[PDB]
A paper describes a structure:
In phylogenetically diverse bacteria, the conserved protein RapZ plays a central role in RNA-mediated regulation of amino-sugar metabolism. Here, we report the crystal structures of full length Escherichia coli RapZ at 3.40 Å and 3.25 Å, and its isolated C-terminal domain at 1.17 Å resolution. The structural data confirm that the N-terminal domain of RapZ possesses a kinase fold, whereas the C-terminal domain bears closest homology to a subdomain of 6-phosphofructokinase, an important enzyme in the glycolytic pathway.
Four subunits of RapZ-CTD could be accommodated within the asymmetric unit of both datasets, and the calculated electron density map provided sufficient definition to manually build secondary structure features for the NTD starting from the CTD-based core of the tetrameric assembly. Overall, unambiguous electron density throughout most of each subunit chain allowed residues 1–281 to be modelled and refined. Areas for which electron density could not be observed include regions connecting the CTD and N-terminal domain (hereafter, NTD) of Chains C and D (residues 153–159) and a loop (residues 99–112) that is disordered in both Chains A and B. The same loop is, however, modelled in Chains C and D where the density was unambiguous. The CTD forms tightly packed dimers in a manner that exactly resembles the dimers seen in the RapZ-CTD structure. Moreover, the quaternary structure comprises a domain swapped dimer-of-dimers formed through the interlacing of the subunits. The crystal structures suggest that three distinct inter-protomer interfaces support the RapZ tetrameric assembly: the homotypic, symmetrical self-interactions between the N-terminal domain and the C-terminal domain, and two heterotypic interaction surfaces between the N- and C- terminal domains.
Numbering used by the authors:
A (entry chain C): 1 to 59, 63 to 86, 88 to 96, 113 to 135, 143 to 155, 157 to 282
B (entry chain B): 4 to 152, 158 to 280
C (entry chain A): -1 to 97, 112 to 152, 156 to 280
D (entry chain D): -3 to 153, 158 to 189, 195 to 281
Amino acid sequence: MVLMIVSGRSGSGKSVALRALEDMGFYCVDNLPVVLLPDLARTLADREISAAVSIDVRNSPEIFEQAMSNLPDAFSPQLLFLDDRNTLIRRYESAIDKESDLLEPLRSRADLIVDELAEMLRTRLLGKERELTMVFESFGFKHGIPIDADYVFDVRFLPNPHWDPKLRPMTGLDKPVAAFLDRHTEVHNFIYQTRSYLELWLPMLETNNRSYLTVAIGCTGGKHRSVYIAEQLADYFRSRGKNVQSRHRTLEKR
Amino acid sequence: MIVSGRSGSGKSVALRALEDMGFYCVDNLPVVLLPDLARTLADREISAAVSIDVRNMPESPEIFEQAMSNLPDAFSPQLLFLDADRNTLIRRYSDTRRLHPLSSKNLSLESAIDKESDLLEPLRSRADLIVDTSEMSVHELAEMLRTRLRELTMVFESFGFKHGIPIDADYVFDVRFLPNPHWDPKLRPMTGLDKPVAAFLDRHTEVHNFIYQTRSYLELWLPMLETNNRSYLTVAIGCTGGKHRSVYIAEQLADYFRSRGKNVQSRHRTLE
Amino acid sequence: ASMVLMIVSGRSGSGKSVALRALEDMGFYCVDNLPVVLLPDLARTLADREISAAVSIDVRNMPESPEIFEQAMSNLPDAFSPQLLFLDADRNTLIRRYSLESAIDKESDLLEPLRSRADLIVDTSEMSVHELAEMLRTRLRERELTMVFESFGFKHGIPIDADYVFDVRFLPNPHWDPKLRPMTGLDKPVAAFLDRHTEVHNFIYQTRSYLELWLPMLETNNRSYLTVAIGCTGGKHRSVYIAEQLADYFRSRGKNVQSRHRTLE
Amino acid sequence: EKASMVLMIVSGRSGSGKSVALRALEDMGFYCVDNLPVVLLPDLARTLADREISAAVSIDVRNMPESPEIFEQAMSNLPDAFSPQLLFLDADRNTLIRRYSDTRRLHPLSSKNLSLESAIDKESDLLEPLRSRADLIVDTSEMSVHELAEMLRTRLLRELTMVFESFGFKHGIPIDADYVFDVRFLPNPLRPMTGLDKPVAAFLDRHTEVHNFIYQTRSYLELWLPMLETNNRSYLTVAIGCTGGKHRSVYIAEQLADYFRSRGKNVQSRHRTLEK
């Protein structure tokens, strides 16, 4: 029932961290006043789940220590701090100067600073391996089914990007193809329903000593629909704390 | 300001704008602890915004009302509600996350959205205003809320075009094509308020159809005009002299919208 | 009786579909690509309805020998007076309208008979869909009621000559998107923005529907002008597009209308 | 033996993109006639029969006879060689409104409609006869015009055969498979027996998780079966795989067939391992 406290300069990705903790099951409350930190736990402790809160420029150490010190035994507090200028500007030094001054009480006593960045948080809260690896690979039926695939799903019935002719040389990773497929509802239903189906058996497939679970998504060419769906399916289970890798057999000279 | 709505309805952009406006915005605060929050800000003397979604909904309306009963006299007790048609929300949802990371497993994406609305009916049913973001863009909801950040008074005024159209008028209706009461020089000195002129125009069906169609046309936009920060909606009925036809119609239009529980005022510019 | 049969012909890309569409607005029953042999049969079906008809004759539809045209033409009921229209545009222009050049010559060659027997010929090299629209209307007058649709900004005041004024300041705003703030309602981006919102279509539809209810009664007493003022705040975005769309609508209704944007002048 | 051609009937509400279909159908070579009166539909066909070319005609609010009986008369008394096929395009009510240019009347030869949404509804009401008897429906609500062009051009307008095959992974994945499901986590069965044998059947039937698996998998396929039935593909091959291809995989495929066979689908089962 940890109380992961998320801190860091404005633009360092604390909003992304809170989202990650949200995926794990933590109750995330943004910009809550520090004084009411006990109240949240007491209200949430009964639910028997962990919680995470954000403390930034929006959110005097006496009240700070007092409020943190004023806390139920059930929940054990942990404090996190995130922290480059050229990168921070991209996420967004008159603002930084006050920000730098204000990042000292907690920063000096911070557990981690933590300065690829998306998944990195998974490594933080343990995780790794001795666990099942989920492989999501795209392929084209004209080239054949990957030899190692365990599940194969045909997506050639979905809307085709070979209909906006400015997309034929693009791949499923390119944002235009993403936006094209994203506007269609059946694409969202397929991703949702396919992973929902896999989650029904994912606890049962984890048994024994399975080393790999390879799910192959197939369209005709293996460059447009299959690539995008496989990546979107992979990204879903990453939010679920799984160890996954995606591989696009056609987009690697084959 | 309480921001609520189905997943994908644009609550995240509202808070960002509202926070930009200067509000203290807190996401996912438990409803019971909403009063406690207010007391902390009272000294600072600033408004606040909070989000209530499927995560925060008590699924028991008493607790919401209970929190309301203990709510301090402060500036911010207003409720905002955003929504969208189901299929648009589905398009907005990036498929790389659970929709209810803290609830059961939803059977279908349209089942999750319906159940979301079903359990979120209490707050909507007693919601101040709804916003159908179905056609609003990413950037459009920002300026709409920024720009949008008492009730509307309907003014029905008759006038004569020969003196000019009222400066404050929002809608102007020309009624100089209607049957003329000057075809009865008994009525030439009488006004539209006098019962003889009323019965004369009432006997003609086209006048009642005009009033019916005119009030019907106004009612089409009246809910959308009521949501603006309009202090007045001025509807001007104009004939040539401003004494016969125009006067009578304004009387009937006012009387109708007054019957609908609307805030109305009547003014006959020429007869004053 | 006395119903018409306007036959529209011309090379592919000369705009017969736009002419055919215009005749449809007037009330014509328009049939595209009907085989010439069935021209009498079509008329007989419409005779009971007592309406005029218009048909297209192209290279796809053109028969192999002119005799069958006259045979079908002669075998059409007396009630119907046939009239033939022929459109032709510049050689290069048709290609732009379609989206070979030797084939286009053959198209002209195969359509020599109808051009020789055309009642009226109209070049469409310089015309735009509006220009040909009123061109057909003119062939089918003057000294009538003139409908003026003018946009204005309420901050500047109401046009003095306005008969109806409609406030549109409750509709979606284009000044929201910071791309469109320097654009006007005439600019295609603002059109697409407002076109995307359904309520804009309903306001235009319902406003013109309301005016048609009283338009016959407003026509009398030798009224020379009916001025409808559409007003937003600045008079450059919403009011311009709505007023322009309203004017364009009644043009299809066979009315004489003018649009004028007080702020954009 | 005999030769036969087609008459594609294009219908749908104003703004649903039937005009694009006719342009596409015209590109393929169809003789396309817009707004032809229904009564003359046979008469038109007779003229084209000799030329031996296909034909396309549009039936919208202008053409529908209000009395639906008249349509059937033309269809029943229609000359042979021409096989009627019906296409119907539709879109969302609010979506059609956005597509509607306001510079022309929507029903230019019918009594004026009360509201923009009443006309679209009445339009739908009057086209229920054609919609109910449509061969294929296309919802254009989410597609632009140019993709609707290429979608129809790419598409042709056959009844679909669903293949359920069991296999063993040690021998390889079937080349012809379209969907593949791994069932190697299910309760394991009997070593010389095959999945067709009732003991292996009763063994797997005894486990409830098998019933949950079949139910969830075929329910999953039904989500896409309407979209796959209208995709010109002649075969949909669903491969169920266990390790040996004789025990678990065999039993699941047969029950999937029996379900879709009970559902009136064209199915065949083939067990790759039990043939060597």
